[PDB]
Design a protein around this nucleic acid. Structure first.
Lengths: 49, 309, 78, 78, 77, 77
RNA sequence: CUAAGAAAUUCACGGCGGGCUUGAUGUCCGCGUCUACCUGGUUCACUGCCGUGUAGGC
């Protein structure tokens, strides 16, 4: 749950507003990858030919 | 000449998910095997998730890690080299005027008083914060702060606070590699209610019988989101158009407390991030000494700042 | 388009992993949520997204390996 | 030429597999994307492409083994 | 002939099966390709061959069982 | 939807923990209740939620790592 | 106020028978999806003075 912090490229009083207002929050879904709480090293493996 | 169509900034001050544990006081110097608290279900005809300390534990311990990465002005993506070169010259001018010392002092102040304990700081009796500098897997420097003597409103002075601000300033400049471990002990009470981070789920249905409130957990251990820790230690902004008495709020473009419903720094007035940044990089107008702190704090936070054109 | 439509599609960028999409009434309420890594988890996620988000009607669509775990033409429509 | 057109067609070079095409506002948004190896995966991919692309209206075209999984004309047109 | 012409005919040697031809500026680019074995797949193949190769405009011809799957505003462009 | 449905889904916000939903006769009786941090506790809770909340005609859905701890005759009543 | 004024085409029927479309084939090469984030306002319950009803404790 974050705030709307981007350039309001529409009008100040837009009839058909292509975005939302600043006093309301916006809810989003994202992917994230973390390390476990006891592991501090990351290993990356590949092969070459 | 023109603001870039794409412009993205990476995140400095990158925290991790804060893990919660419980124990007894006068045992904080050996607290490394304390049992993690767990969320439970409770019926009220609705089911809620609650958390509670054990009946033998009266002290909560919250632990997380922190990094500072340096190179604040360099963007991660761009579209024209001219705007990037002007931006680098502007931020270089700022850091040549004054290094990252005010922002680092406010960050060390927000670490000193345990403001990342959001609602479990209010009914506290005594809070103690410990901060470790991890250099090669060991401890290089330890700081121990009292959080109830260091208030929330005003920014006082202390020798160890200046030392921690020097460490964060050296990390933010680009001359060192700083990894911090932050542990906070709060004396809530014998078996009282702790407040983990509440959950947002965008797939939960509408029909009755569903859970009304679920809490956050990491492998059956009650935890706090990392973004709540970031918003907790980002509240350094106090130079806005409202009068003195409400207190400092967090650094956001069009700085807005959405929980109350108000939005300070409206774009009708010329006191938001975007217009002050545009005047700084395009029309060669520095707004004040105070607004430079706000713009550079908003660049340390990061974001997606792109005008269409 | 009155009933809530639930679809389960397999991603071709790596095979054997599925995604679920829900549409209640003219608007998309769930878009590409991770179903699972086998047909059983995809069938379970489809029935979970049809249990909630549902009016007295719904419809489930999927491949012929995922729709074998759902009971035959009984719990697929309403 | 106002709604989004979704077409599902069987590949004749090997029988049993399907491919989907999506056009919106005279511009081909999706061209010959893999739907699957059975009619159910084709129907799920077609309904997903009608949900995501083509917000106001859509038409779904396809074979008769594929359109047997979609409810009859209730959700095919909008 | 300026626009593209897509014609769906039925094979009289095997009733029920269809075939599709595309015109594309006075020289045929598709000849007697295998459409479906029912009017729905013939309509889908005709709309696919109209989406490609029909960049300015097109005209779709065919039977009444085939063109009952396409609305009347999508056959000519 | 006459048979009672019991589904076990893994929560994608932390991998390795499960949650069970139970619906009986049109309306749901259990929504997103916690199971264990391993497929054994999840399968055991699915069996326990199958005993209660439907005596005839339960359906148990879940992953192949969850439906491998119960016998093949105990998945569909 | 008309090249005006009028009008019953009505019945029947055997198009039949035969057939080898044949072979042959190299689609083929390259790639950076990036960036930021407070679910929160919200657990009117347990058990008792008491025959109801309406006082009280935490």
């Amino acid at each position: 749950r974050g705030t709307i912090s981007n350039r309001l490229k529409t009008k100040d009083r837009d009839p058909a507003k292509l975005d939302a207002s600043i006093q309301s929050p916006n809810l989003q879904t994202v992917d994230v990858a973390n390390l476990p709480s006891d592991a501090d090293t990351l290993k990356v493996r590949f092969t070459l030919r | 000449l023109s603001t870039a169509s794409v412009l993205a900034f990476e995140r400095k001050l990158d925290p991790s998910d804060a893990l919660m544990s419980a124990g007894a006081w006068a045992q904080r110097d050996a607290s490394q095997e304390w049992p993690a608290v767990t969320v439970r279900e409770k019926s009220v005809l609705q089911t809620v998730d609650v958390a509670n300390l054990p009946s033998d534990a009266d002290t909560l311990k919250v632990r997380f890690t922190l990094r500072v990465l340096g190179g604040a002005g360099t963007p991660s993506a761009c579209n024209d080299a001219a705007y990037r070169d002007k931006l680098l010259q502007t931020v270089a001018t700022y850091v040549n005027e004054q290094g990252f010392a005010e922002l680092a002092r406010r960050y060390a102040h927000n670490l000193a008083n345990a403001r990342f304990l959001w609602r479990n700081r209010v009914g506290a009796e005594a809070v103690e914060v410990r901060i470790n500098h991890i250099r090669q897997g060991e401890v290089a420097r330890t700081w121990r702060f009292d959080a109830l003597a260091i208030g929330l409103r005003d920014f006082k002075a202390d020798a160890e606070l200046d030392a921690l601000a020097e460490l964060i300033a050296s990390g933010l400049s680009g001359s060192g590699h700083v990894l911090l471990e932050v542990v906070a002990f709060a004396r809530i009470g014998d078996g009282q209610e702790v407040f983990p981070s509440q959950e947002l789920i965008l797939d939960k249905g509408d029909k009755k019988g569903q859970k009304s409130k679920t809490l956050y957990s990491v492998r059956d251990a009650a935890a706090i989101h990392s973004q709540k820790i970031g918003n907790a230690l980002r509240t350094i902004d106090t130079w806005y158009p409202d009068e003195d008495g409400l207190g400092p709020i967090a650094v956001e473009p069009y700085g807005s407390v959405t929980s109350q419903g108000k939005a300070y720094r409206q774009p009708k007035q010329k006191l938001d991030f975007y217009t002050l940044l545009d005047n700084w990089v395009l029309r060669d107008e520095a707004p004040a000494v105070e607004q430079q702190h706000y713009v550079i704090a908003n660049l340390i936070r990061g974001g997606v700042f792109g005008e269409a054109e | 388009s009155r009933p809530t439509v639930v679809t389960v599609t397999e991603t071709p960028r790596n095979p054997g992993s599925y995604e679920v999409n829900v549409e209640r009434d003219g608007k998309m309420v769930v878009g590409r949520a991770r179903a699972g890594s086998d047909p059983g988890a995809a069938a379970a996620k489809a029935m979970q997204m049809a249990m909630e988000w549902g009016s007295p009607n719904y419809v489930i669509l999927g491949s012929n390996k995922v729709l074998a775990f759902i009971p035959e033409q009984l719990r697929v429509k309403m």
